[PDB]
Each structure stands twice: as structure tokens, then as C-alpha cells.
């Protein structure tokens, strides 16, 4: 038998196969299993509120027609150039921007057909998908990003979408993200869609992302701690009143302010207050306190600037110094560890 | 009856249905009801003067042809591949940039037809639409953005566009905007269009947006208040003449100026003066006053630098200090609350 | 009579209408009237040297064919789907980048035909057009932007382009630009094109744009004036030699320099010197003078630092102070008003 | 004779003209003359390493077929809608990115045919072309940008490309570039291409660009000179040891550093050292020297701070001052003029 | 024999050549040799994690059909307009974004056919390819970028891809990269692909890139060294306690911090610590030490500020100075050379 003759008999003019009619017309809904392979992941930006993903969609369904039973083999790998004639289920993504195809040299498509009629359709598509991330806790946070596959034009009575029991989602080996660590959980559940026009099927896939704090710690926490320690020692040995003494505080003020402004750049605008803002606010309070104590001791010195009074004022000023000395490391220590442990337990609960 | 035979009889060669002729030719204008569903909203930028929206257009009209009365069911869900043969009303948007279609796997289209001839056309389109926002009051403002649907090629005698009496505009559940809060009002009115060529139908939909001031307050108001308070206390204990005393003022000057420059970055250029500019101007006036009073007390000290004269100059200088002390918090307090209450009442009127 | 039968008789196979032949072949040139409507304007950027415009092109010409005289009405509104068969005049823009079409739901096109043969073609196109603006005077300037319509493929003997006597250019009501004010003058003149291949027709439309200086004044002139006044008073009460006195000058130097650098950011690079540069240069000269006078009085004090000599040096130093006092406001006043009046008269002449 | 009948006889089914066969098959190579007109030029960016150009390609060749000799006129201006049937020579650009066509209203194309068979093909194309500029001397430099036209698919035995003897390259009148001045030289030479597959024809066009230094001088040279002069005078009158004296140097240090960082922004990264870097380095050396001399005189003063020794130390310190005084202007003068004259002669040689 | 008649006999209707069937059907897999020519390279950005490349793909395979043996010559250069009829092997790239074709004037394609049936297919394509660079050592690093060619739709039994024994990869003469130096090694190995659907052939090409450190050294190392030396000398002659002395340290602090922030701008965010960070950290430690020693000597002076005690405190303070003097150059010298030699040996091993 020649291949061409059979090939036109299967889906051509002698065949009564109209490509505008669903298989099993006036019958039970056509069940469709969907298997997705993630070729690549990444390019997630906080401002844009979306990520980039390259998938290999694969969907299988059954047809009562296109059952040959004439060649001795089980399956046939057909050309992807008559895919227009074969009926194709509609499938679009709800949180989707763009989503072009790939056409390098030839269109990237795959067609297979078995003896019973089970087909295999494979399409490569790069999707920009919108993820509504919540930045309540900026340095440490778990982000859930949603992929939705749903039927635009058919009701419940047709095109029921089902997941695959085994190996529903696969990932490429040695695939890494610079910023996040992917979690191998990938919980799958499906939520149907209700509209005034009708009720439409949908299936959902969920991915969990964990950020890496190493960059954040080196970029912000480590310099800020250095500034705090520097300020502490600078006043600790500072003596009486000198214009030079003021310089140590002045440098810290400006540098801390610039760092604070710099940190709130990449992130988009949100009403709620992030954790990094809290850390910046407390460090600003500490540096603001530094000036305060100086003003205080200067006021005591001003009152001092008779012999009977001098001893008490000089003593009171020194008392202010030693009390500042013991107080400043202690309250920062009891606060930062409290901050870290409370964030440590919230991530553990999440 | 086979589905294919009926399907070609309805809109094919045996049918006298020419797709270039409007239904009810030489007759009353074809009425069209339009229902819009907002799939997603967002990506509004002040500079660009436009926003991004993903809608689900739905338009219904009646045809005297395409009335089958042969299958026992009421409606038929047809394929979206013969939509070219069906006559389609022209519809374009006036404040429109771009507005591509979506073609993921298959074109996103929907076709339905009832027994009487009422059709249902559904198209997914992402529109970039221009909104002429007025920034007279920057931190608090209500913005109205306009969507216009109008007929490019037909006159009044044809293609009259009407709204839908019930559920004209729907919104997706759990849809949020990072910057703005959408108001559930959505007032609908229609304005016809007049041209030299003729008079063309149009319908309009209006959306109200309310900005969230939480980001603005934390970003700008809170640091500026801190700078003002710091400056106040800094001079409050400042004593006589020392080069060190000057430092407190110097830091504030530069930091305030940098913040003022930084704030006017995101916004585009406009002739009128924004509220934030007013707040920045008054704070700059306060810090400018700080230097002034110093210069004054230094001039009194310069005159002082004989015994009879010294008491009066020293007293006058101290008088200047205490008067500065009582005056500075009081006038800022009576001004900021006045500013807030006047803006509070203008938003209430708006 | 059926509409379809007439519709194919007019421009089909029974008709000898070849769409590759110009009307009035071997005859006088085909005159074409062009009417343009500006749907929207804006998005002008100085660096890119171009603007964005959305027009409604409309062109009318006569054909000896397509004269029906069979239906009792005067005109017919045809579908825009047989516009390919109708002969269309070539028309392109010389200072053009891009210029895509609009295809939302359906192509935006319009076809009309009268009894005599006068047709009406309407096309919506968004054009990015290059405007060679001259920035000799930056804050105040009038910019002329050119739109050119010309025939790519035909000579003088064919396709003569003429303007419309009445209402050649219309503008949408309530159309505004954030930066510029449009002038309702719109002078129209036409310049033919000469090439080695031949002579080609062209028509030109000119628009005048006037910038709004309110943003510029608030952004730059008002802070710079404040810095100048501050500097003036700061030295005015400055006494003898103190390291603190220097601070007043130091702050001004840096802030003025940063503002000067900031101002020359948006503008692209040009050889000639802008007006804003002149204003920045004079203010820099004033602040530079401030340091000078200080150095001078310090040199007199250094010579002073015997009793007979002290009186003359102290007097000379005070003389320098009072002379500085009277001189500094006077020369700035006689210069700034001179600057403003000369620019006021140049705009009036322009 | 009707135009349509002749028009289909020339390139249709009765004609044996196959559009897949080169003219003069099994014969001498088809010679092609190429004339280029530069409609616009500009948009050159140093980082991207490419420029934007809008050309009017024009190529002429001879065909033995398509020789009519039946109409009494010499040439015919055909429609650009049967250009697909006419055989067209392949032509692509080697240093090419993008290069789309223009389709405003109608495709921009031109067809002409003479009695002998000489055709004229005109195509409008905007090309982004890569120019490998060498930035050895940044402020003054001559840049050569290359345009290459070559045959992708044919060997030497076919499609020989020749230039045009007269008026090979034309430029539009009144065409200017904001940054560069075009030179009216435009030397043309051709270099053939060798590959493993075969030898392919190519022709090359060269353009020379001269930068304008006016922006660079005002932006960088003039402020830097002002800073140098200021520093010079500031120390020149500086007296003994005062903390205030230090301020004059401190301001210069920071401002010079910021300017130095600012200048190296637009330019991309290169291994070799630019001229502007040299100028920045020498000015940094001068300001660095300023601090040095201060440290020296302070060390002499420190040793001074017995009567016999005081006279010699005070004298030595004053000697250091006067020597600094004479030395500093002289060495800057003998260096800057040397720098300018050596660059003046290198541009003259180039 | 006419060329047209043979041309349609080879791949037309009289020929039984179906373009949907692979050559050697039901036979051994079709071997394909692939030769790639790199027309241009460059535009590599660290953030995007990808590079731009313009290649000339060339693939050869054998067909049992299309064996003419009728013209006396060996090969024929066909038109690229019947390339659709010829069967073409599928080929796509795995680490691929975009990859459009080039269509300037005509499509860039090449067709050749020999007497035996060996064909030659040439396609020009610009590919954006993702390179997973590792920035463990930023200033000096070798980067490997991967190109993968693989068969989308066929299994092992068909379309085996083989490399070319001689001249597999060629590069254009005089091709340079501004940032990197290409290594003439280009090791080629192939790795097959395993999927649930089946096993698919692939081949890989590897390129090695070496960065040039000249820009980095001038941009960062040279200024930082200057700051370190300046700081060293500044304290080296600094005397006792003066507010002026503090200035030398203050300037360094701010400038070093700004440089440190500036350096970490171009690079994207990564968890691990780069070499440049280490160098910045050590320089920050040195400048931080500068303040420390000052505080120490000031504390000794404070204790000093009775005659018996004064000699020991003054001596101890001077001892601190001389010890600082000998210590500071020595430890920087023993550290920087150690840093350079360890990086020198790691690059040599790599
Ligand atoms: C799809 O599956 C459901 C439940 O398993 C079944 O009731 C229905 O008949 C199936 N439809 C088919 C096989 O077309
Ligand atoms: C549309 O509605 C108007 C007013 O209800 C009516 O006069 C007109 O006949 C309608 N046109 C139709 C039904 O085609
Ligand atoms: C166009 O107008 C000119 C001048 O009015 C006239 O000479 C010419 O015949 C006209 N061409 C037509 C009507 O085709
Ligand atoms: C092209 O020119 C060359 C040299 O002038 C000549 O030998 C060749 O025959 C020409 N080819 C033609 C006219 O086809
Ligand atoms: C391809 O090469 C392999 C090994 O050289 C060989 O076994 C196979 O038959 C070849 N396939 C062909 C020539 O189609």
C-alpha cells in the first residue's frame, strides 16, 4: 500500500471527516488529559507583576473516527503540515499576556495517532503570566504563582479537561533560578468557571517560590550594622564639646538616609509597610537618638559654664555618658534577636 | 439529518446569504446590544497618560435570515472558523492605541445562534486606552477614565448601538489594583458623534479611580516631618556662636533639597502647581527661616562684642531665642492642620 | 433589482474594470483632494526628535467608470471588503517612521460612491513623524512641525495632489497637550519634488507649537533665585573670620552645581548654547564672586594681624563690606530684567 | 489596442516567461547597476554600535525578454502589483539588523520598463547598520561607517553587481545631523566575498563622520578649567593654618570626582584609554597636589611650633608658598597647550 | 531541453514526489550533516543572561529521489521560491528566545542539488540564546555559552544529526568583541535527549569567552588605590587634635562608599559573593581603621589633659603614631599581592 493514498483516505475528500464538527457529536463530553513540561523558567520582575515561562504543552483525546487498522504497526508519526485538518480543542490561559509561538526553520509541532484513535498534540509556547505576589514580608517570603488552562468556547457538556494521573508536571534537569529556589511540591487542583453565558471548564497549576536572602543580607543588613556599630563607638569615646565630635554623627546621618532611599527603589508602590522599612526605621531612630544625647550633655555643660555647682554638673554629665554607654548595646541586642526570631517563626508557620 | 449538510445550507452557496449586505437592507437600523466583561485591569502610568485593560467584548443583534427551525434544540454552538462568512458589525475605539487580538493555540472567538436569529459574538482584546488625568491635587485625587465604542463606517440610519439594561458591566471577582481602589459605580451614558461626512453612533463607559495615599505618606510626609522636628530641636538647644551649631542646619538643607528634587521625578511636566509642591515649598521656607534667625542672633552678638550696653544686647539676644522657641511649633501646627482639613473637605465635595 | 447582482456588475468579471489601470488613461492627470482630521496629538520628545499623531486621512477623486445611474438614490455606502478591487492612489509620508494601521475587530476603512463617480476613501493611521526642532532658546520657543504627503510612483502627468478649499484641516474638540499650546493658524503650502528619475507631486501642512514655561519657572528659576538671595544675605551679616561663616557659601556651591547638572539632562546634545545655560552660568558667576570677596577681606585682615596701621586696615575692610553690600543687589537687578525684556521682545518678533 | 490585453501578453500565460529562470540563462552574467539615495540619516548611538538610515534603493538590469516594440512611446510606468511576476535579483546587507519595508496606504514600490528591456526597480527600506567605531580619541574623532550590498545566492558566473558611473550616491538637500557633520567625499570601492560554498559578489560604500566638539567643550572642559582656577586662587591667598582653609580644597575634590564619574557614563566599556580620561586624570593630579602642599607647609609649621629656629622655619614656609605660587600656573600652561597642539596635529594627519 | 519543463518534472504533478513523506521511508534514519558560519557575535549582557548571534546555517542530506542524470553538468543552483515543495528537516534550538528570519528585498535562502541527490540548504537566522554564566569571580572569568540544535518531531529511527568532520565551525575574519576575547578552541560534543514521548537527537557547540580586565582596572582598582594611599599619608602627617584633621578621613569615607555602591550596579543579584565585593570590603575595613586609630590617640590625649604623668602619655601617643606608620603599608602590601597571586593561579588552573 502506498503511504500517500492512505494518507489522503484518512482525512481527505473521500473521508466524511468534517473538521468543523467535534468528535462524538450529540454524545458524552470529550475528555482531554493535559501534560505540561517546563522547558525553562525565570525572568520574574516585582514591578511588572509577571514572570516568563517556556512550556511544552501536550494534550491527548480520543476520536471514534481516524481508526485505521490497516498498517501492521501501532502508531504513525505524521507530518505537522496537515494539523489544520485535524480537529483541535480550544485552549487559552486566563492570566496571560502575549504568548506567541515559535517558528525557527519550521513550526514546532508534533502529531501522533494510534490504532484506537488516541492522538498526541504537542505545542511549544512562551507565556508571560501575571502573578499577584504579596510583599508583606520583603526579605523572606513565599510566592505562589498561578497557571490556568480553560476552554473559551465550550460548555460542561463538551470538552471536559482532566489532569494526568502520573507525571502531570515535569521539570528540566539542572534548571535553576538566580533569585528563587523552586519547591518540588507543585500541588494541582481544578476550579470551574461560571459566567452569564455559561459554565466553562478550567484546571489550575500552582508553583511555590522561595527567595534567597543572601544578596539582601550583604547588600543592606551588613553595611547598616557596620554604621550602627561605628556610631556607637564614635560617641563612646567622644569627649566633652568639640566641633570635630559632631562629624562622626553627621556622616552617619547622610549615609543612612541615602541607603534608606536606595533600598526602596526596585520595589513597586504598595500601601502596606514592608519588613525592610521597619529595619530602616529602627536604625534611623538609633542614629536620631545619637544627636539627642549630645544635645543633652551639651545642655548640662551649658548650665555648668560656682565651684559648688560645678562638681554636681560635671558628675551628672559623666553619669549621662556612662548610662548611654551601658544602655545603647543592650537595647539593640534585645531588639534585633527578637525581630529575627519572630520572622523565623512566621516563615516556619507559612 | 447530518450536521455538515445543514451547516453548509445555512451560510453557503445554496443559500442566498451574501456577507457583504447588512441584514434588514432598505429597512430600520440594526440595533446592537453590547455587554463588556473586565478580565483584568491595571498597569496605569502617569507619564504615558494611558492604562492597560483586558476585556471580553460581547455583542448581540438580530438577523431575519439564519432562522433554521429544523433541529429540535433551541441554540447551536458553532465553530469559530466560519465567522468570516457571518456578517460582523464594525466597532472601533476612539481613545485607542494598539489593541491586538489573542491567538494562543487557537483564535479566541465564540459563536452562538438561536432559533429566532439572535446571535452572540464574543471577542477577547487587550486595549491600551488614553486617560486624560488632571493632577491638580497629587496625593489625593479621583481619576475618571473613558472607554468609547463607536461605528466607523455607518450612519444613524444603520447600526444603532444600545447598552444592556441588566449587568452591562461586570468585573472579575478578587480583582485588585496595587495603586488605586476601583469604585463600584460605573455610570454609563452615550454621546453621538458629528462629522462633516455624517453622524456616527457612539457609547461611553466611565470608571472612577481613587488613589491610596499610604505609600505617599510613608515615602514623603513622614521623613519631612522628622527633618522639621529635628531642625526645631537642634536650634532650640543651640548655644551662642559655634561652627558646630551650623552643622545641624547644613545637613537639613541638603537633605531637604534632595528629597524635594526626588519627589518631582515620576510625574510628567505640567504647568499648574501640585499639592506636593506646596508642602515642599513650605518646608523649604521653614528650613530657610532657621538660617535667618541664626544670622539675626549673630548680628546682635556682633554688636555686643561697654558694660552698660552688654546687658541690653545679651538680654535682647535671649529674647530672640525664647521668642523663636514659642513661635516655631505654633505656626507650623496652625498651618498643617489647616492644609489637611481644606484638602479633606475638597475630596468630600469631589 | 437585487443588491448582489448590481454589486458584482459594477466591479467584477462582466465589467471591463481592470484594477491595474489608472482612470482617464492617456488623459489629463487625475486630481485628488485631501482632507485630514487630527484625532489626537501629543507624545513629543525632544531627544527622539519626533512626535506621535493619529489622523483620519480622507481623499476624493473622480472616475469615469463606476457611474451606475440605476438605483434611485444618490450615494451608496459600500462594504470595506472589496476595497482591493477599487483602484487606490499611492500616498506616503516623507518624514515618516513606522505608521501602522489599526485593526480592532475589523479593519478601519470607509467606502462611498456617488452617482457621478466621486469616491470617498477614509483610512485611520497613527504616524510617528520627525520634527527638526531648533533649541536656540530653550525656555521660550516656537516649534514648527512638518507633515508631507507625496506620490511615490507617479509623475506630473498623473495623480496631481490638491488641497481642500474649505475645512482642509480640522481638530477634535477639547484636545489638549500637557506641554504645548497649539496655535489655530495651520498655514498650508505645497512644494513639488525633483529627482533624477522624475518630478513628483507633494503637499505640506505646518503646525506651530508654543511651550508653557510654568513648569520650567517653578522647577528651576524659583529655587535658583532663592539660593541667590540666601547667599546674598548670608554674607551680608557675615562677621570677620569664622570657619562657620564659610559654611553658608559651601552649601550654595554644591547645591547650585547639582542643579546645573540636573537641568542639562532631558535635552539632547547640541553645539549651540541654550538660554538656560546662560542663566546657570551667570548664577555660577555670582556664587563664585561670593568666595572672592571673602578671600579679599581675609587678605586685608591678614595684613592687619602697629596701632596706626590697624585703623586704616579695619576701615578698608569695612569699606569692602559696605561696598559689596550696595553693589550685589544692584547688578543682579539691572541684569535679570535686561535678560527678560530682551527675550520678551525676541518672542514678540518671532 | 487595449492596455489590459497587452499587459497580460507581456508577462502572462501566453508568454513563455517563467519567473523562476534568470534572464540570459546559460549565458554571460547579468550585470546590475545600483544607485542609492539617502532620504534621511541619524540616530547614531555609541553603545549600540549602530546607526539608522532611510534609503531609496534603485537597481537597473537588462532582459532579452519583455521587449515589446508595439506601443509608440518609449517607456511605460506599470503598477507595482505585478512585481512578483517580474524576476527580481537577490540583494541583502551584511552588517544588517532588522531592515523592514514601508507599507503606508500602499506598498512603496516603483516599476518601469523601456523599449529595449532596461527595467528600473525602486524600493524604500530603513536599515539599522552596525558601525565598528574606534574611540581612541573621544572628543575629536573621524568615524567611518560601512554599507555592504551583496548577492546571497549567486556565484560569479551570474548577477555581477556594478556601481553607477555618474551620481552613484545622492543626499537630500538640507539634511543635517545634530552631533556629526557629514563629509562630501563618499569614496566607493568593491570587495568580493569568498566562502567554502563559492565566491559571491559585493560592493561597498563608505561614509565619513566628524564629531562636533562644542557640546563637549561646554559640558566638560569649561567647568573643569573653572574648578582648577578656583583651586589655584583659593590656596594662593590661603593663610597659615585654619580649618576654614581646608574647605576650599574639600569642595573641589568631591565636585571633580563627581564630574569625572559623570563623564564616563554615555560611552560603552573599552579596554583602551580615551583622551577625556587623560584630561580627567591630570586635573585629578592637580587637585591631589593641592592637599599635598598644605600638608607640607603644615609640617613646617608643626616643626616651628627657639627664637633662632623660628625665623628659619617661618622663612622656609613662606618660601614654599611663593614657590607654589610661581610653579602652579606655569606647568598647567605648558601642559594644556602641548595637549591641544598634539591633538590638533593628529586630526590633521587623520 | 527547456529548463521549465525539466523543472516541473522534477518536483511537480507528473512526479510522485509527495512533500509530506520523508526520504527513505520504512528505511534507515536520514543522516544530516550541519555546518555553521558565525557572521557576527556580540551584544552580551550580564543581567539578561543571553547573547546575540547571527549565523549562516547549512545542512546537507541525501535523497533517493531528485536524481536527474539528464543535464550534462554536475549541479544546479535553483531558485529559493520552490523551497516549500522540497522536504525540509525540522530543526529548533533549545536555549532560544525569538530567532526571526531576514527578509530584505527577497528572502535569504539558498538551494543546490547535485546529480546523486545531495542537497544544500542555507538559512540566515539571528538567534538570542541564553547563557547561564557563573559570576563567582567577577573581574577575571571564563564563560562558556551553549548552542543546541535538536529535532523536535522525530525519534532515533529517523533524522540522525551528525557534525561535519572538517571545518565544522568557521568565524568571519576580523570579527571582534568590545568586552571579551574569543578563544579559538570551539570543542564540539553531542548529547542525546530523553523524554516520556521518546528519545530525540541533539548536537551541541561550545564557545569560551575571556573577559578583558583593562576597563575594570582603570574604572575601579586605580581610584581605590589612590584613595587608600591618600588616606595613609593624610594621617601620616596629621598632628595631635584638630577639627581640620578629621576632614581628610571624612572625604575618603563618603567617596569610598559611593564608589562601592556604584560598582554593584550593572551586575544582577546573586547569592554568592564576588571578588570585587571582597576588594571593596577590605578597602572599607582600612578606611574604618583610620577613624579607630584617631579615636585611640584622642583617648590618650584626653587622659593626658600631673607633670610626671604627661611624659608617659605623650610618649605612648607618639608610640601609637610611629607604630601605625610602620604597620599600615606593610599589611596592605602583604595582602594585595597574596590576593593577586591566588587569583592568578586559579585562572591558570581554569
Ligand atoms: C469522560 O469521563 C466521564 C467520567 O469518567 C465519563 O462519564 C464520560 O463518559 C467520559 N467521556 C468520554 C469518554 O467521552
Ligand atoms: C431599534 O429600536 C428602535 C427603538 O426601539 C426601533 O424604532 C427600531 O425599529 C429598532 N430597529 C430594529 C428592530 O431593527
Ligand atoms: C485637474 O485640474 C487642472 C487644473 O484645474 C485641469 O487642467 C485638469 O484637466 C484636471 N484634471 C482632471 C479633471 O482630470
Ligand atoms: C557584463 O559586463 C562584462 C564586462 O563589461 C561583460 O564581459 C559581460 O558580457 C556583461 N554581461 C552582460 C552584458 O550580460
Ligand atoms: C547513517 O549512518 C549510520 C552510521 O554510519 C548508518 O548505519 C546508516 O545506515 C546511515 N543512514 C543513511 C545513510 O540513511
Short mmCIF file of C-alpha atoms and ligand atoms in Angstrom, two decimals, chain E residues 24 28-31, ligand 5:
data_model
loop_
_atom_site.label_atom_id
_atom_site.label_comp_id
_atom_site.label_asym_id
_atom_site.label_seq_id
_atom_site.Cartn_x
_atom_site.Cartn_y
_atom_site.Cartn_z
CA UNK E 24 13.91 6.51 2.57
CA UNK E 28 17.41 3.57 7.83
CA UNK E 29 17.41 7.01 9.52
CA UNK E 30 18.25 10.02 7.34
CA UNK E 31 21.71 11.28 8.29
C1 LIG F 5 23.60 6.89 8.74
O1 LIG F 5 24.86 6.47 9.29
C2 LIG F 5 24.80 5.24 10.03
C3 LIG F 5 26.18 5.01 10.59
O2 LIG F 5 27.17 5.49 9.70
C4 LIG F 5 24.34 4.11 9.10
O3 LIG F 5 24.22 2.91 9.85
C5 LIG F 5 23.00 4.47 8.48
O4 LIG F 5 22.64 3.47 7.53
C6 LIG F 5 23.07 5.82 7.78
N1 LIG F 5 21.77 6.20 7.26
C7 LIG F 5 21.55 6.54 5.98
C8 LIG F 5 22.74 6.52 5.06
O5 LIG F 5 20.43 6.84 5.58
#
